Specification:
The structure is a monomer. This protein is α+β, with helices and mostly antiparallel strands. It has a single domain, classed as Gcn5-related N-acetyltransferase (GNAT) (Aminopeptidase). About 35% of the residues lie in helices and about 35% in strands. A 7-stranded mixed β-sheet has the order 1-2-3-4-5-7-6, covered by helices on one side. It is globular. The two termini are about 30 Å apart. It binds acetyl coenzyme *A. Acetyl coenzyme *A (ACO) binds next to strand 4, helix 3 and helix 4.
Length: about 140
């Protein structure tokens, strides 16, 4: 039902679509392609387009991937609501089962209450804070 499409396999329609989330100019298109090219070359980052029954519902990402940890991010398709939990399920499953990391980490601006609540609901704990960010983690064991 829920499937992950690696950014390394995106087609031009998908690239067009997702980078507009908030007449494509050549410089924007070219900058998106250069990003996708870096993803082909960098095993420490992985971005996925997430599908639910052949409909796009958001993007998830894992960066600073090591054998023990990673950072993650998520972004709901902007016309959809209530898909954060699905994206979070996928993030945790993929990190624990596919990357096999013990620690999942993120940081978010303190004003991002939607994201914080979602992380807290999935048993994340705030372990640090600076002027801009809260830093959260979840450990498998
Ligand atoms: C790459 C990155 O940007 S990573 C940083 C995190 N990602 C982002 O900030 C990207 C922009 N934001 C998003 O894509 C979305 O807002 C997401 C994915 C974070 C959340 O999406 P959704 O789950 O669709 O949002 P939704 O409107 O359902 O709200 C999620 C929950 O927070 C709750 N919430 C909303 N506002 C508040 C608030 N002020 N205080 C506490 N909780 C709140 C909702 O009631 C909801 O509760 P539930 O989980 O009990 O149902």
């Amino acid at each position: 039902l829920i499937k992950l499409k690696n950014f390394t396999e995106l087609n031009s329609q998908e690239i067009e679509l997702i980078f507009k989330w908030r007449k494509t100019k050549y410089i924007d298109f070219e900058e998106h392609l250069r990003f996708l090219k870096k993803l082909h070359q960098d095993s420490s980052k992985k971005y996925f387009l997430v599908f639910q029954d052949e409909q796009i519902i958001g993007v998830i990402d894992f960066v600073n991937i090591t054998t023990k940890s990673c950072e993650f991010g998520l972004y709901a398709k902007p016309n959809l609501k209530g898909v954060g939990q699905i994206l979070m399920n996928e993030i945790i499953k993929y990190a624990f089962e596919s990357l096999k990391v013990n620690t999942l980490k993120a940081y978010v601006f303190k004003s991002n209450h939607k994201a914080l609540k979602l992380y807290q609901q999935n048993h994340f704990t705030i372990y640090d804070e600076d002027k801009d960010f809260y830093y959260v983690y979840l450990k498998q064991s």
